[PDB]
Coordinates of C-alpha atoms in Angstrom, one line a residue:
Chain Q
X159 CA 11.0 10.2 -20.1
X160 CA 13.5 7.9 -21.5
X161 CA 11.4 5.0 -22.3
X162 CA 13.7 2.8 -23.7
X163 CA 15.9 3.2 -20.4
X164 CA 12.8 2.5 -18.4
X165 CA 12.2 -0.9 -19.8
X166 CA 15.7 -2.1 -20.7
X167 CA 16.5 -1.6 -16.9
X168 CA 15.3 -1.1 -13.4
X169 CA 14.1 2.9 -12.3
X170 CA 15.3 3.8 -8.3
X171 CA 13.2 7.4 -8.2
X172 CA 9.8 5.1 -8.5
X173 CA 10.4 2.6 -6.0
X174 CA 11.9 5.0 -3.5
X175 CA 9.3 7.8 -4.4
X176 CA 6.8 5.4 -2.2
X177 CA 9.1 4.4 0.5
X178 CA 7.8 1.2 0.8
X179 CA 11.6 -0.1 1.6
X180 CA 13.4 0.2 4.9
X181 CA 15.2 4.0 4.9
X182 CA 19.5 3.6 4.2
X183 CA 20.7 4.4 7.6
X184 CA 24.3 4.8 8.3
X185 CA 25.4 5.7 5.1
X186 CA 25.1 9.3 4.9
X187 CA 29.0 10.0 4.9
X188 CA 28.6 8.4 1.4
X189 CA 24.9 10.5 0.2
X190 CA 27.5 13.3 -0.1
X191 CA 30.6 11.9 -1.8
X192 CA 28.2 10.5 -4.9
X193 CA 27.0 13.7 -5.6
X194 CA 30.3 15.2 -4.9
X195 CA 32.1 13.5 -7.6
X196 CA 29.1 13.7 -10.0
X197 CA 29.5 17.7 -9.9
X198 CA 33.4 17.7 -11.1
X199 CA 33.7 18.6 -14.1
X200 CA 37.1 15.9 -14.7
X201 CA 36.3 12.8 -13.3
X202 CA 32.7 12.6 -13.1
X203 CA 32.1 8.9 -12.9
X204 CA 32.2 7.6 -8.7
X205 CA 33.4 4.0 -8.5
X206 CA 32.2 2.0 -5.5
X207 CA 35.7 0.2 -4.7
X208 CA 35.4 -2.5 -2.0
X209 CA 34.2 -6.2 -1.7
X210 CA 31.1 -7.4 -2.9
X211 CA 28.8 -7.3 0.4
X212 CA 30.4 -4.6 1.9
X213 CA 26.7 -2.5 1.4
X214 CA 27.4 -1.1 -2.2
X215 CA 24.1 -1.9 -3.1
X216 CA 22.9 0.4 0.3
X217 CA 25.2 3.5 -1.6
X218 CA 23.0 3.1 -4.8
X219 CA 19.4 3.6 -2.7
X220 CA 20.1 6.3 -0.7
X221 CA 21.2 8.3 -3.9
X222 CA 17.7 8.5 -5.0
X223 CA 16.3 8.6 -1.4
X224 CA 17.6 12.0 -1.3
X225 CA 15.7 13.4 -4.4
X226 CA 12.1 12.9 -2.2
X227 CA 13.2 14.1 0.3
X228 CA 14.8 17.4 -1.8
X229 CA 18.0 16.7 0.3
X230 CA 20.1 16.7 -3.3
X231 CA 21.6 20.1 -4.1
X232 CA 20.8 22.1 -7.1
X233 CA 23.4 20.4 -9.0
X234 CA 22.0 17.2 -9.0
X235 CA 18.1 17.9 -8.4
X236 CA 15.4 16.5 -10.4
X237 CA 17.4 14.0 -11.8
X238 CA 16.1 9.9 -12.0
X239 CA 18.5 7.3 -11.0
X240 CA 19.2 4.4 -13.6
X241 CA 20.6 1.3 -12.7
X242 CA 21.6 -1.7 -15.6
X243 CA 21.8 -5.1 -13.9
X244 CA 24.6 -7.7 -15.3
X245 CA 21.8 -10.3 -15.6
X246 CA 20.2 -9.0 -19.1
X247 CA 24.0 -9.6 -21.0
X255 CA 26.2 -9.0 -31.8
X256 CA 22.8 -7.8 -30.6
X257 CA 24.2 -6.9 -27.1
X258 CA 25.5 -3.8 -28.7
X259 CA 22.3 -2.6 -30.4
X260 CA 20.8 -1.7 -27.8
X261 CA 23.4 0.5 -25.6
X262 CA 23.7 3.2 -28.5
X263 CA 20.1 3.9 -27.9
X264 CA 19.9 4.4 -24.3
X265 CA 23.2 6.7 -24.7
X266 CA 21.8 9.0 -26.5
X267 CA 18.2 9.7 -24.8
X268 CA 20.7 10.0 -21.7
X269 CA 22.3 12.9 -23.3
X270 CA 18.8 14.9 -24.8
X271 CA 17.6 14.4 -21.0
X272 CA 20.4 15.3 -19.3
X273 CA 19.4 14.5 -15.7
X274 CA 19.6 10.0 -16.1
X275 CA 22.5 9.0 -14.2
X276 CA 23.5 5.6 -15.3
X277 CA 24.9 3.0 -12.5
X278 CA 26.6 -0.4 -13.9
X279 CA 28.2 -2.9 -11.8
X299 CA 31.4 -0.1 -26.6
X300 CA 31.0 2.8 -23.6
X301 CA 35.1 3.9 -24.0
X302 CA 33.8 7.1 -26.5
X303 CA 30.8 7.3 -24.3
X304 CA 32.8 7.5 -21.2
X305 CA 35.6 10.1 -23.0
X306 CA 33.3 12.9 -23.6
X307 CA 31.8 12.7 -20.4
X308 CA 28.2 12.2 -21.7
X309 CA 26.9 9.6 -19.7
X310 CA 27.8 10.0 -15.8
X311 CA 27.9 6.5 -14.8
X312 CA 28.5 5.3 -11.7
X313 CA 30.6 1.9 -11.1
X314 CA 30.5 -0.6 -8.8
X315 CA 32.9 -3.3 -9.7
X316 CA 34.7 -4.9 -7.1
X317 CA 39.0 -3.2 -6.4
X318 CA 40.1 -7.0 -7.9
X319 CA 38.2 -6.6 -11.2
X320 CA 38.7 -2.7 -11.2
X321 CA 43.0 -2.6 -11.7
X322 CA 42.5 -5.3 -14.2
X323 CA 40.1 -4.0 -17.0
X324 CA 39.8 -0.1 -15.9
X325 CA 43.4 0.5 -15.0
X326 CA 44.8 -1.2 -18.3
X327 CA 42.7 1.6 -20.5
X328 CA 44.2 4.9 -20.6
X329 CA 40.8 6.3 -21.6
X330 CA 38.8 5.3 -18.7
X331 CA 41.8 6.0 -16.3
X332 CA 41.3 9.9 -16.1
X333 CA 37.3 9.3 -16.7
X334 CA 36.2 7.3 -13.4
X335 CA 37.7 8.7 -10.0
X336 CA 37.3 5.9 -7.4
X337 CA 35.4 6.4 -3.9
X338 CA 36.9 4.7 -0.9
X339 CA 33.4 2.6 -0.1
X340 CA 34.2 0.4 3.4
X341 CA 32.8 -1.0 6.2
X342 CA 31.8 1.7 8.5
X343 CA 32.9 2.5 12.3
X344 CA 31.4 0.4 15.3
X345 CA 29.9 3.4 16.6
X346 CA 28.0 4.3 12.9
X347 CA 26.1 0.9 13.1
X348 CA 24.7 1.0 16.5
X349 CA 22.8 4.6 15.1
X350 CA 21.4 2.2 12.2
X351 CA 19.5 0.1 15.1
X352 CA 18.3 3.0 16.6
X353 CA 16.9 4.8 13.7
X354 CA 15.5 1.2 12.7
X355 CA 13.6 0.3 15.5
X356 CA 10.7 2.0 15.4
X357 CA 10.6 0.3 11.6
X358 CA 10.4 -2.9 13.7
X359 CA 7.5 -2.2 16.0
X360 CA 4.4 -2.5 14.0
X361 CA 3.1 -6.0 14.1
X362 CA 2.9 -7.2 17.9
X363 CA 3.5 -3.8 19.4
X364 CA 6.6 -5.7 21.8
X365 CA 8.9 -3.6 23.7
X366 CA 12.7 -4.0 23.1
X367 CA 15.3 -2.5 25.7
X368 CA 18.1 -0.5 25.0
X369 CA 20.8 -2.5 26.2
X370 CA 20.4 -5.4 23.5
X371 CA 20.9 -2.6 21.1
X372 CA 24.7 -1.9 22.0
X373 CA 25.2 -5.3 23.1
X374 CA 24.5 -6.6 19.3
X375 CA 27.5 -5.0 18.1
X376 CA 30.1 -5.7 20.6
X377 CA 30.0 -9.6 20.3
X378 CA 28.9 -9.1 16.5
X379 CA 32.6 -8.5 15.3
X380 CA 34.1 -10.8 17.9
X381 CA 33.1 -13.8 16.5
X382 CA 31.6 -13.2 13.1
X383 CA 34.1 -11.1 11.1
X384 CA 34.3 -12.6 7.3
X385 CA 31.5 -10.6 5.4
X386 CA 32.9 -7.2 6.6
X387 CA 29.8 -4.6 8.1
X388 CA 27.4 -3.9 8.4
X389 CA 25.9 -6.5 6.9
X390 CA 28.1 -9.1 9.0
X391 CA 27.5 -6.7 12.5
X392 CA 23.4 -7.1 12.2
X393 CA 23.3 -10.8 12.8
X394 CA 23.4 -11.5 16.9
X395 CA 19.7 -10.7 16.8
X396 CA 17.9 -13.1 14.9
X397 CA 17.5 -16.3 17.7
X398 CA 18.7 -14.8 20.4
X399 CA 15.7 -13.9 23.1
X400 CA 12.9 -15.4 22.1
X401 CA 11.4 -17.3 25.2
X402 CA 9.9 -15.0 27.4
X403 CA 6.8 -13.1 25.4
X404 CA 4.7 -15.7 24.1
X405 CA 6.1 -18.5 26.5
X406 CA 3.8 -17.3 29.0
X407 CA 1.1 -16.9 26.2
X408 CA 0.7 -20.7 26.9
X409 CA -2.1 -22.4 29.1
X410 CA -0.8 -24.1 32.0
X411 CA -3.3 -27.5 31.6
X412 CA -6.1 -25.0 31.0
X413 CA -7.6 -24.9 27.2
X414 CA -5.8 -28.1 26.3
X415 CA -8.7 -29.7 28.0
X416 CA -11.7 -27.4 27.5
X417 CA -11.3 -27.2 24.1
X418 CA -10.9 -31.2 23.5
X419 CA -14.0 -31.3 25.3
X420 CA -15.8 -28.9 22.8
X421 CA -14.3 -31.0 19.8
X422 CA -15.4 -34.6 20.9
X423 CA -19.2 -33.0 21.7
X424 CA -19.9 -31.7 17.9
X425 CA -18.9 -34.4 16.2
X426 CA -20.8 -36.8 18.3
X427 CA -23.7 -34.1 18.2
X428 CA -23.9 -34.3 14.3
X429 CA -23.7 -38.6 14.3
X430 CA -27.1 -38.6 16.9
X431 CA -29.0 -36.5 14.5
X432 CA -29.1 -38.9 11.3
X433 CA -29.4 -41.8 14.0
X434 CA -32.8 -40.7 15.6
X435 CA -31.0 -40.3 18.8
X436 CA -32.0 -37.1 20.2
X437 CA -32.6 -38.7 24.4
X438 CA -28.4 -38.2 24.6
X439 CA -28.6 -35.2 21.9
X440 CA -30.7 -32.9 24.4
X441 CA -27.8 -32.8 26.9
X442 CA -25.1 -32.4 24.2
X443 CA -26.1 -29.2 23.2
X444 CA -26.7 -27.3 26.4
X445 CA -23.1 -28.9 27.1
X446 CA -21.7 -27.5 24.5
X447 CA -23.5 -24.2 24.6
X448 CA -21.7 -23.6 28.4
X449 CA -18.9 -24.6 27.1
X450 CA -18.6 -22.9 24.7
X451 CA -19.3 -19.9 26.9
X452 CA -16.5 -20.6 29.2
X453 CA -13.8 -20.7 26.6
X454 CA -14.5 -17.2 25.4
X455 CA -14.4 -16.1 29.4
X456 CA -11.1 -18.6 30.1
X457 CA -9.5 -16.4 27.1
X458 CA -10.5 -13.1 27.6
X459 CA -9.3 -13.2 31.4
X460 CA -5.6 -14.8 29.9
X461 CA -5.1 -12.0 27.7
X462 CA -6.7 -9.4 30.2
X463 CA -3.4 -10.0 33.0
X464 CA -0.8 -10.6 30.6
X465 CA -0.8 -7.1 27.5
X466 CA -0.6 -4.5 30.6
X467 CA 3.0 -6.0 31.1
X468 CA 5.7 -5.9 29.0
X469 CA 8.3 -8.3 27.3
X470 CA 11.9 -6.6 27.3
X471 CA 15.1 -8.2 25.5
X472 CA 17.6 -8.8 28.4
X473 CA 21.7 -9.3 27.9
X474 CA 21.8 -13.0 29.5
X475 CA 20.0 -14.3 26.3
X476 CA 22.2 -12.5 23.5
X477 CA 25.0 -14.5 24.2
X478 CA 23.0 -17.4 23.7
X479 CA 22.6 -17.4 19.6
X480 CA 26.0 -16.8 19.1
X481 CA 26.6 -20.0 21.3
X482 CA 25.4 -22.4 18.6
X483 CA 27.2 -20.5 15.4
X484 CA 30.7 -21.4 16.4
X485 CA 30.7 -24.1 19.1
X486 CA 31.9 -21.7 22.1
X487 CA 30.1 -22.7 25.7
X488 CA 27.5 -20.6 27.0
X489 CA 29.6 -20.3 30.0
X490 CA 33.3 -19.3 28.3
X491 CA 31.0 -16.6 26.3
X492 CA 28.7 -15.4 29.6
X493 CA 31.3 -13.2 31.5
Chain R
X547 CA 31.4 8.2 -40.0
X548 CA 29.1 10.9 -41.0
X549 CA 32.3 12.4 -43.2
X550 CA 30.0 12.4 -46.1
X551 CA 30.2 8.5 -47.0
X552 CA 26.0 8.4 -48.2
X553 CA 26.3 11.5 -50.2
X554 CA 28.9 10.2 -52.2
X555 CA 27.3 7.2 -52.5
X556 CA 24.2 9.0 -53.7
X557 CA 26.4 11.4 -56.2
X558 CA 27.3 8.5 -57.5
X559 CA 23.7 6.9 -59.0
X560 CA 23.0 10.4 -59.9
X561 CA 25.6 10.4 -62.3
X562 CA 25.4 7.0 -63.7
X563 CA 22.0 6.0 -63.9
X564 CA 20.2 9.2 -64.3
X565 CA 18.7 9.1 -61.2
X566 CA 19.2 9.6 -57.1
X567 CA 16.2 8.4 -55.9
X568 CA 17.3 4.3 -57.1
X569 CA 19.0 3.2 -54.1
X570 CA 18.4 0.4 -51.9
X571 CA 19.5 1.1 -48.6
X572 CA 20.6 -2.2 -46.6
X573 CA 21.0 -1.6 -42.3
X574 CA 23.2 -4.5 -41.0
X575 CA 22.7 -3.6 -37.5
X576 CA 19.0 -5.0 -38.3
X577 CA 20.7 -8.0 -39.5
X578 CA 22.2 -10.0 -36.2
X579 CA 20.4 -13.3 -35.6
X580 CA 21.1 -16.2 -37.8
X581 CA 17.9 -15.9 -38.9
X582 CA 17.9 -12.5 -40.5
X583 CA 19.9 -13.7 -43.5
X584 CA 16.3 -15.2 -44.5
X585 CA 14.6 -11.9 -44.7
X586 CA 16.6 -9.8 -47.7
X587 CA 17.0 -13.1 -49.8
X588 CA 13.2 -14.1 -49.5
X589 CA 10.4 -15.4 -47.3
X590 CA 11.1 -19.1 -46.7
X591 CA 8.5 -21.7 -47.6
X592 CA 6.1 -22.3 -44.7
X593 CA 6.7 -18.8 -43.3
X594 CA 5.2 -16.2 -45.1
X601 CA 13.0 -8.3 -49.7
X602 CA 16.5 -7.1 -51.5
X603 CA 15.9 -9.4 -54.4
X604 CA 12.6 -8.4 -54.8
X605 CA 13.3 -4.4 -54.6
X606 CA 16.8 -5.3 -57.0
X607 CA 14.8 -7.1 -59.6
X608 CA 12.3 -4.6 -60.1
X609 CA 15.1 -1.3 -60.6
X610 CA 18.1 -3.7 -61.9
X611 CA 20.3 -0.4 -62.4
X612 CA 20.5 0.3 -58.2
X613 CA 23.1 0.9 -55.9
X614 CA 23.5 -1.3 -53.1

C-alpha cells in the first residue's frame, strides 16, 4: 500500500474516489494522451509542456477520475495516482530511494513531479512531469539520459467551442443552494467577450471570468420591502425593550397594552412575510445579455456604451 | 556497489582476528544533521555508541 509514498506526499485515487470536487470537464482530449504515453514501452514518462496556468493541474485530476469511473483501459487499471509537491524540498536524498523502490514491488504508483537520472533510465518509475517548456529545454534537454526517457505532450489552451461544453456540463453543479434559474444565452455570451478583452492567463482559466459580477440585480432586488417591514419590525423592537424596563419598575397600567401590542404584531409580521415570499418563488430570475457587458466594463475602463452593441 | 565490497571486508576480520562476527558496522546515510556526529562519539552531558562498541572488542573492523 506504499505507506511511505502515502505520507511523504498527497494520494489523488482517495480524494477523487468521493467526488467531493467539481468533475474536469473539457479535458478529455488529454484523459487519453496520459495513458497513451504511459503504455509505450520507450518513452513512458508524459510531460505537461505549457505555461504555468494553462490548467496542467486539471490534466493531473482527471487521470485518477477515470479509475472510479473504470473509464482507464486494462493497461492502466487499478493503479493509484501519486503526486510529489515542490513545497516539502543531504537528507533530501534519503528519502527518494525509498519511495522508488516500493514503486517498483507495487507496480501500479505512478509518480507525478512538477538523484532520479538511474531511476528514470530503466524505466522503473513512470513519472509524469509538469515543468513549465522554459525550464524543460534547460535542465531536461541538456541530459542525454532523460532525453530519450520523457516524451513531451503538447498541453494548451483549448478551442472556444471546448469551453462553452465545460459551462454546460457545470451548471447543474451550480444549482444547489438557491435553486435560481440561469438562461442559456449568458452561457455562450461568456466566452465571446471573455477572450476579447482578457487574454493574458491563456484558457480556460482566463475564459471563465465574465461571470462573477455581472447580473446580479434582479433576484433578490425585488426580495426587498418597499417601506413595508422597515417599520413593522422597528415597531416590534422599541415595544420589548420598553416591555422588559416596566416590569422591575412596578409599572404594569402601560405594560397591559404593550403586550397585546406586541402579540398582533407580532402576528402581522409572520402574515406580511409569508404573503412576500408567496407572489415572488412561482417566478423566476433569468440572467439576460444587457448585464454581461456590464462587469467587464469596470476591469478595463471601456464605456458601457462602446461595449453594448 | 553490491560487487562484493562487505564480503571482503568481512574475509578480512576472519582472517586476522580469528573471528567474522567482530565488526562494527557504521551507516552514514543515518548520519546527515549536524547533530548526528554527537551520537557515535557519545551522549552529550545534559542529554542522555562507536566508542563504546570499539572499546569493548579493540581488535574490530570499522
Amino acid at each position: 500500500n506504499t505507506p511511505t509514498l502515502d505520507s511523504l506526499a498527497r494520494d489523488l485515487t482517495v480524494i477523487a474516489k468521493d467526488g467531493t470536487l467539481d468533475p474536469v470537464i473539457g479535458r478529455d482530449k488529454e484523459i487519453t494522451r496520459v495513458i497513451e504515453v504511459l503504455s509505450r514501452r520507450t518513452k513512458n514518462n508524459p510531460v505537461l509542456i505549457g505555461e504555468p496556468g494553462v490548467g496542467k493541474t486539471a490534466i493531473a485530476e482527471g487521470l485518477a477520475q477515470a479509475i472510479v469511473n473504470n473509464e482507464v483501459p486494462e493497461t492502466l487499471k487499478d493503479k493509484r495516482v501519486m503526486s510529489l509537491d515542490m513545497g516539502t524540498v543531504g537528507e533530501f536524498e534519503e528519502r527518494l530511494k525509498k519511495v522508488m523502490e516500493e514503486i517498483q514491488q507495487a507496480g501500479n504508483v505512478i509518480l507525478f513531479i512538477d538523484i532520479l537520472k538511474p531511476a528514470l533510465a530503466r524505466g522503473e518509475l513512470q513519472c509524469i512531469g509538469a515543468t513549465t517548456l522554459d525550464e524543460y529545454r534547460k535542465n531536461i534537454e541538456k541530459d542525454a539520459a532523460l532525453e530519450r526517457r520523457f516524451q513531451p505532450v503538447q498541453v494548451d489552451e483549448p478551442s472556444v467551442v471546448d469551453t462553452v461544453a465545460i459551462l454546460k456540463g457545470l451548471r447543474d453543479r451550480y444549482e444547489a443552494h438557491h435553486r435560481i434559474n440561469i438562461s442559456d444565452e449568458a452561457i455562450e455570451a461568456a466566452v465571446k467577450l471573455s477572450n476579447r478583452y482578457v487574454s493574458d492567463r491563456f484558457l480556460p482559466d482566463k475564459a471563465i471570468d465574465l461571470i462573477d459580477e455581472a447580473s446580479s440585480k434582479v433576484r433578490l432586488k425585488s426580495h426587498t420591502t418597499p417601506n413595508n417591514l422597515k417599520e413593522i419590525e422597528q415597531e416590534i423592537e422599541k415595544v420589548k425593550n420598553e416591555k422588559d424596563a416596566a416590569v422591575h419598575a412596578q409599572e404594569f397600567e402601560n405594560a397591559a397594552n404593550l403586550r397585546d401590542k406586541q402579540t398582533k404584531l407580532e402576528k402581522q409580521y409572520e402574515e406580511a412575510k409569508n404573503e412576500w415570499k408567496n407572489a415572488q418563488n412561482g417566478m423566476s430570475t433569468s440572467l439576460s445579455e444587457e448585464d454581461i457587458a456590464e462587469v467587464i466594463a469596470g476591469w478595463t475602463g471601456i464605456p458601457l456604451t462602446k461595449i453594448n452593441e | 556497489t553490491g560487487v562484493g565490497k562487505t564480503e571482503l571486508a568481512r574475509a578480512l576480520a576472519e582472517s586476522m582476528f580469528g573471528d567474522d562476527d567482530a565488526m562494527i558496522r557504521v551507516d552514514m546515510s543515518e548520519f546527515m544533521e549536524k547533530h548526528a556526529v554527537s551520537r557515535l562519539v557519545g551522549a552529550p552531558p545534559g542529554y542522555v555508541q562507536l566508542t563504546e562498541k570499539v572499546r569493548r572488542k579493540p581488535y574490530s573492523v570499522i
